[PDB]
């Protein structure tokens, strides 16, 4: 899910369980700091990468001069009936050519795909 470091020793932390209370106790191995695992999760791996690119498309690409511009498909939060589209261009992320749209208002940027 993530990764945590010390509170007083500025060092990286590994996972470990409690022999007595039977709880995942993230404990420093370079030092003697411990904490209870609120998440109760240790590892996750999305090998096929279902995670859509929308989580990381930057908003300022809209004001790139060289991309296309389409009048249709107005934005949701603001009407602003003109936006830009461009393919994923991300090798191995997914083999779907779904066009990604981003609104081109000065302060907007609500992104969507359809």
């Amino acid at each position: 899910v993530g990764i945590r470091f010390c509170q007083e020793c500025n060092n990286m932390l590994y996972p470990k369980e409690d022999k007595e209370n039977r709880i995942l106790l993230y404990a420093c191995r370079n030092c003697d700091y411990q904490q209870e695992a609120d998440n109760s999760c240790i590892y996750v791996n999305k090998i096929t990468h279902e995670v859509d690119e929308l989580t990381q498309i930057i908003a300022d690409v809209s004001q790139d001069p060289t991309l296309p511009r389409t009048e249709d498909h107005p934005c949701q939060k603001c009407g602003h009936k003109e936006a830009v589209f461009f393919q994923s261009h991300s090798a191995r992320a997914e083999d779907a050519m779904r066009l990604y749209y981003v609104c081109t208002a000065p302060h907007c940027g609500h992104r969507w795909t359809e």
Binding site: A96, M97, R98, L99
Partner: protein, 48 residues
């Protein structure tokens, strides 16, 4: 004998009839429209 008959090649051998040009332009326009259609399908994700 070719001295008598003679052979040549020129612009007149490269110009075609106006009807031919119109048909050729129509064919090219139809092909461009068809590829626009298929790329539109690919963009909208229906090209199986």
């Amino acid at each position: 004998w070719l001295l008598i008959e003679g052979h040549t090649i020129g612009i007149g051998d490269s110009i075609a009839d106006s009807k031919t040009y119109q048909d050729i332009q129509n064919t090219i326009k139809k092909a461009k429209q068809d590829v626009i259609e298929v790329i539109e399908k690919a963009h909208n994700n229906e090209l199986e």
